[PDB]
Amino acid sequence: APQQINDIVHRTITPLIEQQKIPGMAVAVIYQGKPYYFTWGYADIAKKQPVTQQTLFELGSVSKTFTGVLGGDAIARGEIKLSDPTTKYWPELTAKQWNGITLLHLATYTAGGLPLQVPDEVKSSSDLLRFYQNWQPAWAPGTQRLYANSSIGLFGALAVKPSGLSFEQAMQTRVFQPLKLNHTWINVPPAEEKNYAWGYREGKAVHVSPGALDAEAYGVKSTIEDMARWVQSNLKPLDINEKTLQQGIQLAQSRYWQTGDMYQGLGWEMLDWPVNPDSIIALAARPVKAITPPTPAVRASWVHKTGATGGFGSYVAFIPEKELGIVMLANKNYPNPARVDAAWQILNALQ
Numbered sequence: 568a569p570q571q572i573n574d575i576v577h578r579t580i581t582p583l584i585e586q587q588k589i590p591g592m593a594v595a596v597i598y599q600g601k602p603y604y605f606t607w608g609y610a611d612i613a614k615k616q617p618v619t620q621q622t623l624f625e626l627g628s629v630s631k632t633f634t635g636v637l638g639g640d641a642i643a644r645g646e647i648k649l650s651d652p653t654t655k656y657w658p659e660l661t662a663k664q665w666n667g668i669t670l671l672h673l674a675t676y677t678a679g680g681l682p683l684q685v686p687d688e689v690k691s692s693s694d695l696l697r698f699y700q701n702w703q704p705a706w707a708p709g710t711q712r713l714y715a716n717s718s719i720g721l722f723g724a725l726a727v728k729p730s731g732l733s734f735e736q737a738m739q740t741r742v743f744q745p746l747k748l749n750h751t752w753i754n755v756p757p758a759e760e761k762n763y764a765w766g767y768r769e770g771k772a773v774h775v776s777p778g779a780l781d782a783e784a785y786g787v788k789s790t791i792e793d794m795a796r797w798v799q800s801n802l803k804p805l806d807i808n809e810k811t812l813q814q815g816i817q818l819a820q821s822r823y824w825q826t827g828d829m830y831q832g833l834g835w836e837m838l839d840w841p842v843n844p845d846s847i848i849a850l851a852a853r854p855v856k857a858i859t860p861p862t863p864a865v866r867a868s869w870v871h872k873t874g875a876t877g878g879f880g881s882y883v884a885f886i887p888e889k890e891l892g893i894v895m896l897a898n899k900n901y902p903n904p905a906r907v908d909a910a911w912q913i914l915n916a917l918q
């Protein structure tokens with residue numbers, strides 16, 4: 568590994584792991600297209616299993632990027648349109664607040680105040696229908712962004728209806744398999760359990776809990792190798808041989824809404840590069856300006872996504888015009904600003 572990369576990564580991540588008491592971490596830097604891997608610490612403290620290039624971590628909300636790309640692929644297949652009313656794919660959603668709420672609003676958190684989480688009380692699918700029928704929007708469609716699992720989770724479930732595939736089968740066959748992400752899972756198979764890191768919350772070993780729309784909003788688990796491949800694919804989607812997937816990748820990085828310095832993609836969020844990290848809270852409602860029509864994927868962008876579960880903390884960022892990116896996977900949910908600080912320190916040095 569070129570010494571510059573070695574040094575910038577170790578000099579940044581080592582103190583980070585010490586300050587944040589992270590049990591285990593894996594990092595990939597993609598530099599001029601090629602990935603370089605680094606690991607530290609423990610996937611399972613009790614059993615003294617080290618983090619390796621094959622360890623699975625919960626991506627948490629970095630999963631929203633897969634959901635956005637799979638939606639993008641479905642659009643490219645002509646199966647759905649972002650301008651389609653939500654009710655077109657869920658006819659039972661008859662309550663009048665849904666008039667004017669499109670797949671775009673769902674995908675981009677702009678439906679009018681759908682909550683961060685589907686309530687824990689929602690167990691059955693009829694419970695889920697009740698939830699969305701009874702939800703009262705605080706705002707008109709397309710006026711305010713509130714980051715929400717119940718918003719993009721629903722987008723993901725609806726985007727796959729026409730295919731006739733379950734969300735998992737569609738994700739596996741249309742995204743994971745074409746990109747050779749053979750160790751990326753919505754449901755960890757028994758064969759891979761030995762690789763599945765424990766997350767650590769208040770020092771307790773924990774895994775993600777089942778919940779409504781989990782798969783679609785925060786349910787993917789992946790290795791640092793596969794996540795490096797996910798970054799390469801998003802960096803360079805013209806490399807991709809499957810036409811609708813290449814298109815879906817590009818659609819997920821289009822700029823649909825602006826709030827401050829940030830643009831909302833499908834799953835991905837983007838800022839113009841260069842940026843300062845200073846530029847890069849349980850509820851944060853923000854007015855959005857519509858980008859009419861959406862701007863095509865911009866190459867000079869910091870494109871990123873943070874992800875958390877109770878026990879894990881993940882971050883991915885890349886800059887297309889520099890062929891440069893980073894994936895940070897940890898089995899502790901440590902503060903976002905620290906992730907972004909470390910990632911900026913690393914990419915800025917190599918750029």
Ligand SMILES: *[B]([O])([O])[C][N]S(=O)(=O)C1=[C][C]=C(C2=NN=N[N]2)[C]=[C]1
Nearest residue numbers: 627628774775776785874875876877
């Ligand atoms: B995303 O990572 O930004 C979603 N964040 S979330 O706050 O909605 C969230 C946090 C933790 C879980 C979780 N379920 N079981 N363990 N952790 C789910 C959603």
